Symmetry: D2
Subunit: 299 residues, 4 copies
């Protein structure tokens, strides 16, 4: 785990821009990568849940991975979410990530069909092999995957040879502490942005989050405040993040974020892919106001 | 619903054979199609959950659809499960099913990401358009999809223009009855094989099931028995189905079925795709014995 | 379990009438017992969920047990639900049921606090001992108890010395069949009225239900129809039961039932105990019409 | 809410000691009350889930309330958990709490039968009336109650006239923050001991907990450390609390706690009431060593 310590940080879960024909918008993808870099983000987690991985083909996911590396390789840390239900598909994406010079790969626990724990372990092992030396970030998100990993199961997964981190999108902060206690050196990303300050206090040492695309400096601010013992500032920042997250949950998170980025002149067309619909027009004034507030704040 | 009456019956949820390199085994696919036809099945439901849809590419799913139509079009009913999380991908499969001469299309409620009910409705409408005249079979499987659907939501879905049937993979037989009561003419497929007799009694007028690949005649026997008022034979047949299902659940259902079909000289290599593992070798004697029992019973 | 065979049948889960002050309405209880007897009911299940056991004191529950035995002992079968969270409290009620000359006792799996399976087992053993010869009816209602027993755990419970039946308030009709297959002689009561026909088909040999208080003859009609191979009549009766159940679920089931019984001149004051509120006035025309309908139909 | 500020703090959810015959062990109950006061606990939450309320009669619960008020009234804050499924039973216990001079009442959302949100509200209103001026602590524990309240529903409940606090036994720390943001003055007790530090950070201003009976000073220590900006001490203390909680979850929490207290000479017979069984003998060494560790630490 100590050999992956350079993966520690606050990493935006990159959104994948589309146009009105639902095609990849590669110009907006480049703009969003540069926007994140200019903001001072530590890294990008590419083609994850927030990236709409599960409504893209392997080819599309590869095209996005390739472009992000062109834009960002060597400037910030790059994690490729290569996870699919299929192991073989996941391996293809892992091999591509390696070719493009990503720093790490990542895979969600495969979903839909119930798999045995042993089947999960073998899935990670196979993807790790295809990653050809890129460390693996195990991605746990029980709310969407339906996969209910026990602590003992998590301990086994995060100690597989080649695993360097866990992205823990769980609100169970007892379990967060338990993981930190068992694995003192493990890179442990908090995945729910709306508990980030609490997740760090429980033992996370960074995070990966969708909302970091529009306000990642606030999460950096929380890490800094907690490091300095400035509890009030950490709380204030988390409160401001949660005010924003309340709105995004109302509007739909990915599309709300894309809409903010559109009003920030970053994303040309703020659409997610079908079956996501567009943002309800009634929310547009709040989203524009938020874009303006955040632009004023970031300066 | 009246117009889609011809879709009523007992339809096997077709397995997709693979080889040891995890490639499609097209020769075994043709053998399994013909094996199902010779059992006297009413039709096939192709590329569904049982067909390992979600570990195949669109191209692979299309190749399978095309072969099944070559082998079976005009001889038995053909329903193409075209569902993906992506609407656009689902539409491509629906257009392909139309080109190949399928009798109907079907789509699981899209999963992983939470979608609103309106979004689900639009997804079905879009697929129905691309199906270009083929009726839609709505596919409800809350246990795997994570989409619960209220009764009112089901009623709205099954009355969209172009919907001709519901595949109801739910053990809630109060809801089964409520659906029948609201929609007297709706084709209503019982989805859980281990309650088939009870599901018919509650109001299903047919079924779509994985285990029909190895013993579809038993399910047709339950239909006949209940039609004749012969309750004891219906129960006896369901009990025998359930003795089989108990075993299949222990071994893993799809791979156990493929293993039975291998011992029956239908499927060359009884593998599912990774991350499914192989059948535990400790179960092979029981599966071989089962294959021999069913071959003896069938003649 | 051939010793408990005489417990087989269709038994109403007796409601507990209260007066305007929410005290026991003894006169209405006596009238309701006689009303049930005159419908041709096989027995009464007293002080269960439907009897509002969990908002009564032990003394109150005993008073109800005593009165019902006075009114009904030797005329129909009498099952005392003695279950509490506390084992000792349950034993007190079991001892009382024995003194009053009940035919059997019953206990819900103790709830609120998680208990181990062994602890569940010891609870039933202790209550069985205090019942001093009265057979025990294990009562399984996962939806309310929160207790999620495996099939194996059910098998162990129903084979404890002194256990003569299982009241299975579960809509899992695979499990209903599994239980019947494992225990061919076990008295197995279907607990969800809205799947009664399907539950019998799966393996139940009777039922215990709240709605039997207002239309028990319909359930006896289903038993008769299925015995005679008359599937149509069984379905028609189940459908009619479910029309009523739809309404009762809208109104609140216990209070809706008590309101129907008020309009049938049995229950003086159709209130449940706080925190149950009154029936919404808007439902009274429907409940009155139902009362009139059922009275014209009769036993 | 701001008038109930006096209820803020760290309150032990008192255990109910029983004798070998499973009756109330009054001598051990008195010792446990005094033990808690000596640890510097802010108050006691009596006849809760931890007190094994739901395996006691109303009379038994009243006997406990009376004895605790005898032992503690005026020295520390006293909150009576009076909640039952029945509203009338809960009212009886609220009336008793008032007679015994408790500072507040509390009630778990009534369970087993599903009740409408309107019905929950009326249940609390009725209990508040019977408490006759004692503020109400709404008690939310979805994992045991099966009651899944929305944030809007919580907001309505905690703003009923007479409600002065929320005991929030939920691990959802987004919701904890939302509650604090909507109700800046509300007393908000963190209920899961194993996330206490994180719960305070999210917006709780105190806690009610079972493990406070054996190491309440540690929780007070977390409060102090966070107030001082001493994040490492707060984290260290939380880690130590969780090492203990890991063990108690293995042993069974209430019986494990009673066993630790037995080895501390507080509880004569460390049994919970049936259907709870005894602690597995295999855990006795660890529980005995924990008792020694904690006595040495205090």
């Amino acid at each position: 785990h100590h050999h992956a310590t350079n993966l520690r940080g606050v990493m935006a879960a990159l959104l994948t821009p589309f146009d009105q024909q639902q095609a990849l918008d590669k110009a907006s993808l480049r703009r969003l990568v540069q926007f994140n870099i200019q903001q001072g983000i530590d890294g990008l987690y590419v083609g994850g849940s927030t990236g709409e991985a599960f409504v893209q083909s392997l080819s599309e996911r590869e095209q996005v991975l390739e472009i992000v590396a062109e834009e960002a390789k060597g400037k910030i840390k790059l994690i490729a979410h290569v996870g699919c239900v299929s192991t073989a598909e996941s391996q293809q994406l892992a091999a591509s990530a390696k070719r493009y010079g990503f720093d790490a790969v990542s895979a969600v626990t495969p979903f839909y069909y119930p798999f045995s724990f042993e089947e999960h372990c073998d899935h990670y092992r196979a993807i790790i092999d295809s990653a050809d030396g890129l460390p693996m970030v195990v991605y746990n998100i029980p709310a969407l995957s339906g996969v209910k990993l026990t602590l003992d199961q998590i301990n086994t997964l995060v100690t597989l040879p080649g695993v360097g981190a866990l992205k823990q999108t769980s609100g169970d902060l007892y379990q967060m502490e338990q993981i930190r206690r068992e694995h003192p050196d493990l890179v442990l990303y908090n995945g729910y942005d709306n508990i980030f300050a609490s997740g760090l206090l429980a033992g996370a040492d960074g995070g990966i989050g969708s909302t970091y695309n529009i306000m990642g400096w606030r999460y950096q601010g929380i890490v800094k405040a907690l490091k300095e013992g400035d509890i009030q500032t950490a709380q204030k920042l988390q409160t401001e993040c949660n005010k924003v997250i309340d709105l995004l949950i109302k509007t739909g998170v990915f599309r709300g974020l894309k809409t903010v980025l559109h009003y920030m002149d970053v994303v040309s067309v703020p659409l997610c892919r079908k079956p996501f619909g567009p943002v309800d027009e009634k929310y547009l004034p709040e989203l524009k106001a938020l874009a303006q507030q955040l632009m004023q704040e970031r300066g």
